Ligand binder design. Structure first.
Ligand SMILES: *[C@@H]1O[C@H](CO[C@H]2O[C@@H](C)[C@@H](O)[C@@H](O)[C@@H]2O)[C@@H](O[C@@H]2O[C@H](CO)[C@@H](O)[C@H](O)[C@H]2NC(C)=O)[C@H](O)[C@H]1NC(C)=O
Ligand SMILES: *[C@@H]1O[C@@H](C)[C@@H](O)[C@@H](O[C@@H]2O[C@H](CO)[C@@H](O)[C@H](O)[C@H]2O)[C@@H]1O
Ligand SMILES: *[C@@H]1O[C@@H](C)[C@@H](O)[C@@H](O[C@@H]2O[C@H](CO)[C@@H](O)[C@H](O)[C@H]2O)[C@@H]1O
Ligand SMILES: *[C@H]1O[C@H](CO)[C@@H](O)[C@H](O)[C@@H]1O
Ligand SMILES: *[C@H]1O[C@H](CO)[C@@H](O)[C@H](O)[C@@H]1O
Ligand SMILES: *[C@H]1O[C@H](CO)[C@@H](O)[C@H](O)[C@@H]1O
Ligand SMILES: *[C@H]1O[C@H](CO)[C@@H](O)[C@H](O)[C@@H]1O
Ligand SMILES: *[C@H]1O[C@H](CO)[C@@H](O)[C@H](O)[C@@H]1O
Ligand SMILES: *[C@H]1O[C@H](CO)[C@@H](O)[C@H](O)[C@@H]1O
Ligand SMILES: *[C@H]1O[C@H](CO)[C@@H](O)[C@H](O)[C@@H]1O
Ligand SMILES: *[C@H]1O[C@H](CO)[C@@H](O)[C@H](O)[C@@H]1O
Ligand SMILES: *[C@H]1O[C@H](CO)[C@@H](O)[C@H](O)[C@@H]1O
Ligand SMILES: [Mg+2]
Lengths: 48, 210, 106
């Protein structure tokens, strides 16, 4: 159970603001788009 | 038969609020004379109230606006799924308005997605609907209000599977038709789309102040 | 111009509830947008919050006790600093007229 995830050149990370942080007009759209990617991947998967 | 009277006014209370307007109050007692064996009752009020103004602005919580218009019903990495048995999705957005002065932010999902078929501009058959319920007498308060009911060419929606079951977490999503179809129907009264009729409303009351 | 400052707006009836006192400006009273103000006790109680439509009033009695008639119900835009839906200023009225029928035959 000692697995550890190393941050490397293949890893990608971006902050997801909390609910109250989402109300800024530019972070509004980020919480919009980060939420669409959430529902998109799980239900439709990939055509690849 | 002793006549009572008011005593000295006590210390005034500080302004209990740090913003906008508040209320301070002064308090007195009828303790020095005191009505004995009857008499009166000090005559007046033993509590004065006063408004205090901090002259500094204060909050209000933002409210959700009405949901916008549904996006076009599309499928990822596919072209138009119109007039086809291909269930897609569409999104909708809200806007938080009215939040001022460090007020509480809007609570809830500002985006909404649901599954859909696409009948945008799809040629389909139709049948005349029955007479709709009589609308409101318009214009109210205006000269000669009239109601209006109508029959319209209702499209025959295709019998597609209303529910598509996906796995992952075993999620089943309702599918709703989207789009403005082209309902085909025989002419009724020289009209193909909608035929209505108006009737004046009888004994109209005047609009006055409540 | 000074005005009577109330601490609460009922909205259910459009009344000014909880009198805080008088002799204060409107800008100071509505610093707390939850308050309300009216001129003397004549009426027309306006809250200090964003203007929003009240509830539709009960239908007025049918204009005739015989055959088809007409009945009204009102709705008042109440608030401060802003407008209701439809470019409506606080205090304006909106009416719905519906055909009523107390007795179907005279
Ligand atoms: C999606 O549908 C479900 C299931 O309820 C409806 O499903 C249709 C396929 C059809 O059979 C219809 O008659 C049925 O009502 C909705 O969940 C709730 O289900 C109960 C059980 O029938 C209904 O009584 C409720 O009206 C219904 N809606 C509620 C509780 O809001 C579901 O709401 C609907 N929409 C979404 C987004 O899931
Ligand atoms: C004092 O400092 C001010 C800068 C505000 O932060 C005030 O907050 C407000 O206080 C009143 C009641 O005291 C409430 O009506 C407001 O909702 C609240 O934001 C603070 O008290
Ligand atoms: C309500 O009750 C009805 C039964 C009538 O008595 C109404 O009075 C008026 O009667 C004349 C006929 O005599 C009708 O033409 C009127 O429509 C009706 O208003 C009464 O108001
Ligand atoms: C108290 O109030 C006033 C004076 O403050 C008078 O009506 C009277 O003196 C009473 O005792
Ligand atoms: C309080 O009010 C005034 C003084 O401010 C007087 O009527 C009297 O002193 C009373 O106690
Ligand atoms: C959008 O969705 C429904 C109306 O379709 C309601 O929950 C509400 O009006 C929201 O703004
Ligand atoms: C999206 O869905 C329908 C239109 O297809 C309506 O309920 C409304 O326009 C909503 O925005
Ligand atoms: C409507 O009118 C008649 C039925 O009343 C038919 O010609 C046809 O159903 C049309 O849709
Ligand atoms: C409207 O008119 C009559 C009922 O009043 C019927 O022919 C039918 O219900 C139509 O929709
Ligand atoms: C309007 O007129 C009456 C109700 O007043 C009914 O025949 C029906 O509801 C129609 O829509
Ligand atoms: C009157 O109309 C409906 C209820 O009949 C709602 O939109 C709201 O209550 C309004 O005051
Ligand atoms: C008017 O119409 C009926 C009563 O006639 C009810 O739905 C309600 O009282 C409304 O105000
Ligand atoms: Mg493959």
């Amino acid at each position: 159970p000692n697995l550890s995830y190393i941050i490397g050149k293949d890893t990608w990370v971006e902050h997801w603001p909390e609910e109250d942080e989402c109300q800024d007009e530019e972070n509004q759209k980020q919480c919009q788009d980060l939420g669409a990617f959430t529902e998109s991947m799980v239900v439709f998967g990939c055509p690849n | 038969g002793v006549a009572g009277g008011w005593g000295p006014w006590g210390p005034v209370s500080p302004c209990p609020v740090t913003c906008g307007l508040g209320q301070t109050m002064e308090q007195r007692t009828c303790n020095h004379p005191v009505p004995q064996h009857g008499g009166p009752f000090c005559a007046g009020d033993a509590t004065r109230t006063h408004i205090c103004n901090t002259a500094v602005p204060c909050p209000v919580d933002g409210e959700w606006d009405s949901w916008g218009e549904w996006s076009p019903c599309i499928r990822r990495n596919m072209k138009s799924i119109s007039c086809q048995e291909i269930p897609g999705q569409q999104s909708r957005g809200r806007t938080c308005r009215g939040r001022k002065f460090d007020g509480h932010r809007c609570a809830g999902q500002q985006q909404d997605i649901r599954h859909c078929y696409s009948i945008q501009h799809c040629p389909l058959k139709g049948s005349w609907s029955e007479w709709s319920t009589w609308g409101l007498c318009m214009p109210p308060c205006g000269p000669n209000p009239t109601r209006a009911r109508q029959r319209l060419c209702t499209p025959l929606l295709p019998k597609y599977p209303p529910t598509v079951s996906m796995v992952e977490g075993q999620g089943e999503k309702n599918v709703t038709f989207w789009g403005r179809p082209l309902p085909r129907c025989e002419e009724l009264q020289g009209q193909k789309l909608v035929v209505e009729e108006k009737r004046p409303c009888l004994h109209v009351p005047a609009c006055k102040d409540p | 111009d000074p005005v009577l400052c109330f601490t609460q707006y009922e909205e259910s009836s459009g009344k000014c509830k909880g009198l805080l006192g008088g002799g204060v400006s409107v800008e100071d009273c509505c610093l707390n947008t939850a308050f309300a103000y009216q001129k003397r006790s004549g009426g027309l109680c306006q809250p200090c919050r964003s203007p929003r439509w009240s509830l539709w009033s009960t239908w007025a009695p049918c204009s005739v006790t015989c055959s088809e008639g007409s009945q009204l119900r009102y709705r008042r835009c109440v608030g401060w600093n802003g407008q209701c839906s439809g470019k409506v200023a606080p205090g304006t009225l909106e009416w719905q007229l519906q055909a009523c029928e107390d007795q179907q035959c005279c």
